[PDB]
């Protein structure tokens with residue numbers, strides 16, 4: 001074994017928001033010193049493209065260097081399932097290394113988003129859990145955040161998506177707030193980004209009552 | 210590199226129910242043919258024990274054999290944090306291989322278990338999601354199942370435990386049932402096994418209203 005290549009997708013939020021810039025990232029590790037230069041070729045559905053920015057080669061505390069090539073991806077292209085290929089070439093190895101990536105494939109399914117208020121019993125306490133159920137979505141790439149009366153409520157945690165029995169995915173997000181805010185009647189909103197939603201975004205709000 | 214050892218815990222439910230028999234499992238892989246015999250020593254907190262059942266050595270479709278040693282563990286011992294050691298000895302390697310395992314460590318915290326009924330909107334549908342929140346537990350080993358009017362309802366899925374902001378864990382379980390059963394008023398119960406509960410078991414029931 002010589003050098004290795006790893007091809008990384010963009011982050012899901014970058015793919016879902018037009019104002020962001022998704023990019024895909026090809027990385028080669030275990031490049032030697034004696035035969036140490038390397039060329040990256042990039043293709044989008046088999047046709048070569050030339051706008052990748054490759055980063056200053058850089059040495060590891062082990063015997064190797066590493067070099068990253070970053071390719072900007074169009075919102076459309078990525079969500080339309082275009083395939084991205086990184087070809088890496090070295091004298092140090094027999095044939096160039098070939099990696100491909102695209103968005104998770106499969107018919108898309110829109111999430112159903114449901115907010116659930118605290119249980120009776122939890123209203124014995126100093127804090128309460130506000131719950132967002134997101135289910136029936138496909139593919140599993142998704143983002144969830146909470147907001148109130150405008151601003152983001154950063155005391156929440158979200159489970160990973162769980163494959164459901166029908167082949168779609170669900171998850172839950174749990175927002176914790178002082179029981180006061182809840183009874184003061186404040187408005188909390190669970191907001192969800194996923195490719196199959198209209199404009200890849202939806203929100204559901206929750207309020208005492 | 211020669212042979213490798215892997216030491217596996219019991220299953221959480223086996224540890225939590227007295228009627229079950231938890232056992233821990235030591236496995237050696239990449240045993241050679243030329244120097245191929247092996248001895249297992251087992252210790253519970255540093256003192257040797259002699260009741261492990263070691264299995265018929267067995268050959269791999271690659272160049273190696275594999276041999277498993279299984280040690281029965283007492284309910285108490287495992288939940289009281291006793292440490293289990295598998296020592297594996299071979300001529301094929303310099304010194305014997307040493308592996309230790311015990312229950313996840315850390316002060317235990319009892320789960321709070323809360324059932325949440327369907328959202329308004331979900332009651333537009335042919336099916337409804339019944340929700341069990343389990344939170345504040347430690348360590349993360351846990352089991353959840355649903356039952357109704359006696360029997361187990363096997364159309365449910367449970368998220369993995371998620372580390373929460375206070376260092377405890379939570380999860381959600383989602384049971385789906387025909388909207389009818391729900392309105393027919395049936396009784397559904399979320400049941401939870403975890404070491405910090407009284408008798409390692411608790412249940413919470415859910416019913417229309």
Ligand SMILES: *[C@@H]1O[C@H](CO)[C@@H](O[C@@H]2O[C@H](CO)[C@@H](O[C@H]3O[C@H](CO[C@H]4O[C@H](CO)[C@@H](O)[C@H](O)[C@@H]4O[C@@H]4O[C@H](CO)[C@@H](O[C@@H]5O[C@H](CO)[C@H](O)[C@H](O)[C@H]5O)[C@H](O)[C@H]4NC(C)=O)[C@@H](O)[C@H](O[C@H]4O[C@H](CO)[C@@H](O)[C@H](O)[C@@H]4O[C@@H]4O[C@H](CO)[C@@H](O)[C@H](O)[C@H]4NC(C)=O)[C@@H]3O)[C@H](O)[C@H]2NC(C)=O)[C@H](O)[C@H]1NC(C)=O
Nearest residue numbers: 004006008009010011022023024025027029030060062064
């Ligand atoms: C000398 O030292 C070097 C260290 O400098 C050694 O290099 C390391 O070698 C390993 C050899 O395996 C490398 O591979 C492992 O790593 C990847 C995952 O790496 C990421 O995460 C780790 C942190 O855990 C980081 O160290 C890396 O930097 C990576 O971080 C991500 O970087 C990305 C690039 O920037 C980020 O993506 C971008 O993020 C941007 C954010 O600013 C932006 O969002 C962009 O849009 C986005 O593109 C990403 O965010 C970073 N994430 C984090 C959290 O930081 C791992 O995938 C490799 O595993 C796969 O391969 C093995 C091969 O058999 C599998 O067994 C393994 O399970 C796994 O998956 C398998 O692979 C195939 C596909 O190849 C699957 O189809 C299989 O199904 C699957 N197997 C199974 C069972 O399912 C691997 O674990 C390691 O990354 C190297 N380190 C670095 C820094 O590169 C070198 O080895 C040393 N040499 C010697 C001789 O010892």
Ligand SMILES: *[C@@H]1O[C@H](CO)[C@@H](O[C@@H]2O[C@H](CO)[C@@H](O[C@H]3O[C@H](CO[C@H]4O[C@H](CO)[C@@H](O)[C@H](O)[C@@H]4O[C@@H]4O[C@H](CO)[C@@H](O[C@@H]5O[C@H](CO)[C@H](O)[C@H](O)[C@H]5O)[C@H](O)[C@H]4NC(C)=O)[C@@H](O)[C@H](O[C@H]4O[C@H](CO)[C@@H](O)[C@H](O)[C@@H]4O[C@@H]4O[C@H](CO)[C@@H](O)[C@H](O)[C@H]4NC(C)=O)[C@@H]3O)[C@H](O)[C@H]2NC(C)=O)[C@H](O)[C@H]1NC(C)=O
Nearest residue numbers: 213215217218219220231232233234236238239269271273
């Ligand atoms: C020749 O062929 C053989 C195949 O026959 C090759 O052997 C394989 O070699 C691998 C070398 O790594 C082995 O290790 C991997 O496997 C374990 C996990 O194995 C389990 O799961 C897989 C399925 O994915 C099965 O194949 C195994 O059988 C194991 O299944 C479990 O068996 C247990 C024993 O029965 C079960 O437990 C019992 O279950 C009972 C149920 O009846 C009962 O409940 C008992 O109570 C209970 O005890 C269990 O249920 C079975 N589960 C399932 C789902 O079936 C894996 O852990 C190894 O990974 C660790 O080690 C590497 C080392 O670096 C890590 O990088 C890796 O991440 C991982 O964790 C790391 O390790 C350390 C601790 O060592 C951690 O502290 C680190 O932090 C951690 N790393 C990180 C990043 O966090 C590894 O993946 C593989 O198991 C072998 N197969 C078999 C069958 O043994 C052999 O290699 C070949 N030879 C050559 C030369 O090629």
Ligand SMILES: [Zn+2]
Nearest residue numbers: 041049050051
């Ligand atoms: Zn070019």
Ligand SMILES: [Zn+2]
Nearest residue numbers: 197198199200
């Ligand atoms: Zn639309």
Ligand SMILES: [Zn+2]
Nearest residue numbers: 075079199200
């Ligand atoms: Zn779009």
Ligand SMILES: [Zn+2]
Nearest residue numbers: 250258259260
């Ligand atoms: Zn003995």
Ligand SMILES: [Zn+2]
Nearest residue numbers: 406407408409
């Ligand atoms: Zn008690």
Ligand SMILES: [Zn+2]
Nearest residue numbers: 284288408409
């Ligand atoms: Zn007990």
